[PDB]
Motif scaffolding. Structure first.
Motif, PDB file in Angstrom:
ATOM      1  N   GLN A  21       0.849  -1.196   0.000  1.00  0.00           N
ATOM      2  CA  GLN A  21       0.000   0.000   0.000  1.00  0.00           C
ATOM      3  C   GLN A  21       0.861   1.214   0.000  1.00  0.00           C
ATOM      4  O   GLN A  21       1.762   1.347   0.804  1.00  0.00           O
ATOM      5  N   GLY A  22       0.621   2.077  -0.932  1.00  0.00           N
ATOM      6  CA  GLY A  22       1.372   3.323  -0.975  1.00  0.00           C
ATOM      7  C   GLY A  22       0.605   4.468  -0.333  1.00  0.00           C
ATOM      8  O   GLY A  22      -0.301   4.277   0.470  1.00  0.00           O
ATOM      9  N   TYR A  23       0.945   5.676  -0.760  1.00  0.00           N
ATOM     10  CA  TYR A  23       0.283   6.903  -0.307  1.00  0.00           C
ATOM     11  C   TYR A  23      -0.300   7.690  -1.500  1.00  0.00           C
ATOM     12  O   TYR A  23       0.098   7.536  -2.684  1.00  0.00           O
ATOM     13  N   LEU A  24      -1.294   8.509  -1.151  1.00  0.00           N
ATOM     14  CA  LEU A  24      -1.832   9.489  -2.058  1.00  0.00           C
ATOM     15  C   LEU A  24      -2.404   8.776  -3.261  1.00  0.00           C
ATOM     16  O   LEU A  24      -3.309   8.023  -3.095  1.00  0.00           O
ATOM     17  N   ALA A  25      -1.890   9.046  -4.450  1.00  0.00           N
ATOM     18  CA  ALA A  25      -2.466   8.455  -5.655  1.00  0.00           C
ATOM     19  C   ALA A  25      -2.273   6.911  -5.624  1.00  0.00           C
ATOM     20  O   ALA A  25      -3.077   6.158  -6.221  1.00  0.00           O
ATOM     21  N   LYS A  26      -1.221   6.470  -4.912  1.00  0.00           N
ATOM     22  CA  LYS A  26      -0.864   5.070  -4.786  1.00  0.00           C
ATOM     23  C   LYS A  26      -1.378   4.489  -3.464  1.00  0.00           C
ATOM     24  O   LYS A  26      -0.847   3.517  -2.962  1.00  0.00           O
ATOM     25  N   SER A  27      -2.469   5.013  -2.954  1.00  0.00           N
ATOM     26  CA  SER A  27      -2.998   4.613  -1.632  1.00  0.00           C
ATOM     27  C   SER A  27      -3.695   3.235  -1.539  1.00  0.00           C
ATOM     28  O   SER A  27      -3.930   2.698  -0.422  1.00  0.00           O
ATOM     29  N   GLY A  28      -4.011   2.653  -2.667  1.00  0.00           N
ATOM     30  CA  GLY A  28      -4.627   1.322  -2.586  1.00  0.00           C
ATOM     31  C   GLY A  28      -3.530   0.276  -2.499  1.00  0.00           C
ATOM     32  O   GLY A  28      -2.363   0.630  -2.291  1.00  0.00           O
ATOM     33  N   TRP A  29      -3.960  -0.966  -2.651  1.00  0.00           N
ATOM     34  CA  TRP A  29      -3.089  -2.119  -2.577  1.00  0.00           C
ATOM     35  C   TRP A  29      -2.778  -2.546  -3.987  1.00  0.00           C
ATOM     36  O   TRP A  29      -3.674  -2.615  -4.830  1.00  0.00           O
ATOM     37  N   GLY A  30      -1.512  -2.915  -4.220  1.00  0.00           N
ATOM     38  CA  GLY A  30      -1.041  -3.335  -5.550  1.00  0.00           C
ATOM     39  C   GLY A  30       0.188  -4.192  -5.358  1.00  0.00           C
ATOM     40  O   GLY A  30       0.754  -4.306  -4.234  1.00  0.00           O
ATOM     41  N   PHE A  31       0.589  -4.914  -6.435  1.00  0.00           N
ATOM     42  CA  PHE A  31       1.800  -5.684  -6.393  1.00  0.00           C
ATOM     43  C   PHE A  31       2.975  -4.682  -6.461  1.00  0.00           C
ATOM     44  O   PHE A  31       2.868  -3.617  -7.034  1.00  0.00           O
ATOM     45  N   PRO A  32       4.081  -5.019  -5.793  1.00  0.00           N
ATOM     46  CA  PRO A  32       5.271  -4.216  -5.846  1.00  0.00           C
ATOM     47  C   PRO A  32       5.826  -4.179  -7.258  1.00  0.00           C
ATOM     48  O   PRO A  32       6.066  -5.189  -7.848  1.00  0.00           O
ATOM     49  N   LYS A  33       6.024  -2.959  -7.777  1.00  0.00           N
ATOM     50  CA  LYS A  33       6.523  -2.749  -9.096  1.00  0.00           C
ATOM     51  C   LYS A  33       6.909  -1.263  -9.262  1.00  0.00           C
ATOM     52  O   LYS A  33       6.553  -0.398  -8.499  1.00  0.00           O
ATOM     53  N   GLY A  34       7.629  -1.015 -10.325  1.00  0.00           N
ATOM     54  CA  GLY A  34       8.026   0.334 -10.657  1.00  0.00           C
ATOM     55  C   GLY A  34       8.612   0.413 -12.091  1.00  0.00           C
ATOM     56  O   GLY A  34       8.794  -0.578 -12.830  1.00  0.00           O
TER      57      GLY A  34
HETATM   58  C1  JH1 Z   1      -1.533   5.842  -9.329  1.00  0.00           C
HETATM   59  C2  JH1 Z   1      -2.365   4.602  -9.464  1.00  0.00           C
HETATM   60  N1  JH1 Z   1      -1.968   3.580  -8.495  1.00  0.00           N
HETATM   61  C3  JH1 Z   1      -0.840   2.856  -8.468  1.00  0.00           C
HETATM   62  C4  JH1 Z   1      -0.906   2.053  -7.331  1.00  0.00           C
HETATM   63  C5  JH1 Z   1       0.100   1.051  -6.928  1.00  0.00           C
HETATM   64  O1  JH1 Z   1       1.046   0.773  -7.683  1.00  0.00           O
HETATM   65  N2  JH1 Z   1      -0.079   0.444  -5.742  1.00  0.00           N
HETATM   66  C6  JH1 Z   1       0.959  -0.390  -5.141  1.00  0.00           C
HETATM   67  C7  JH1 Z   1       2.274   0.344  -5.020  1.00  0.00           C
HETATM   68  C8  JH1 Z   1       2.389   1.454  -4.203  1.00  0.00           C
HETATM   69  C9  JH1 Z   1       3.583   2.148  -4.090  1.00  0.00           C
HETATM   70  C10 JH1 Z   1       4.659   1.689  -4.797  1.00  0.00           C
HETATM   71  F1  JH1 Z   1       5.847   2.347  -4.693  1.00  0.00           F
HETATM   72  C11 JH1 Z   1       4.595   0.594  -5.608  1.00  0.00           C
HETATM   73  C12 JH1 Z   1       3.397  -0.089  -5.707  1.00  0.00           C
HETATM   74  C13 JH1 Z   1      -2.135   2.374  -6.737  1.00  0.00           C
HETATM   75  N3  JH1 Z   1      -2.769   3.295  -7.439  1.00  0.00           N
END
Ligand code: JH1
Length: 149
Positions: A21-34
């Motif tokens: 789980q990230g923050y802000l725009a990335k606040s949901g749950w997702g697989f680790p990637k970049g």
């Molecule tokens: C902007 C759209 N969005 C992307 C995520 C996402 O990638 N979530 C998991 C994640 C979080 C932070 C990380 F650095 C890497 C992976 C969620 N919403």
């Protein structure tokens, strides 16, 4: 858009997957990637992104032809499949500045599509905190069927 690489880590039972789980725009749950760096091989980018976000090094476990790749609005994301990682593994990101939390999730409980709003006569999809993971779940389920049973 620049390709992204990462990993679907599963435990020893093959029941659970590791999400971040990230923050802000990335606040949901997702697989680790970049995002891939210039001149960086897909496998090194995956390991690098997974190590930055989880503190777990996948380099000794990556298998070259075991991945799921999706093109989503013209951006390629490829997640290497890394089974068999013990559930008691201790994960810690590089900075709590990008990663809020890291958890195992049951594959069978994760959604593999979002729900519409048909009970509300409204177009579109309801928000789902797993929306970034969701597009990989059906392909993972099918891939695990074809490689384990
Ligand atoms: C902007 C759209 N969005 C992307 C995520 C996402 O990638 N979530 C998991 C994640 C979080 C932070 C990380 F650095 C890497 C992976 C969620 N919403």
């Amino acid at each position: 858009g620049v390709p992204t690489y990462g990993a679907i880590i599963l435990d020893e039972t093959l029941e659970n997957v590791l999400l971040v789980q990230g923050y802000l725009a990335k606040s949901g749950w997702g697989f680790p990637k970049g995002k891939v760096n210039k001149e960086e091989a897909p496998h090194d980018c995956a390991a690098r992104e997974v190590f930055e976000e989880t503190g777990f090094d996948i380099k000794d476990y990556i298998c070259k032809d075991d991945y799921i790749e999706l093109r989503i609005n013209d951006q390629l994301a490829r997640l290497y499949i890394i089974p068999g990682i013990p559930k008691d593994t201790k994960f810690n990101p590089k900075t709590r500045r990008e990663i809020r939390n890291i958890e195992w999730f049951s594959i069978e409980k994760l959604p593999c599509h979002r729900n519409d709003m048909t009970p509300k006569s409204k177009l579109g999809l309801a928000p789902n905190k797993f929306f970034m993971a969701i597009p990989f779940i059906r392909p993972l389920r099918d891939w695990l069927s074809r490689r384990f049973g």
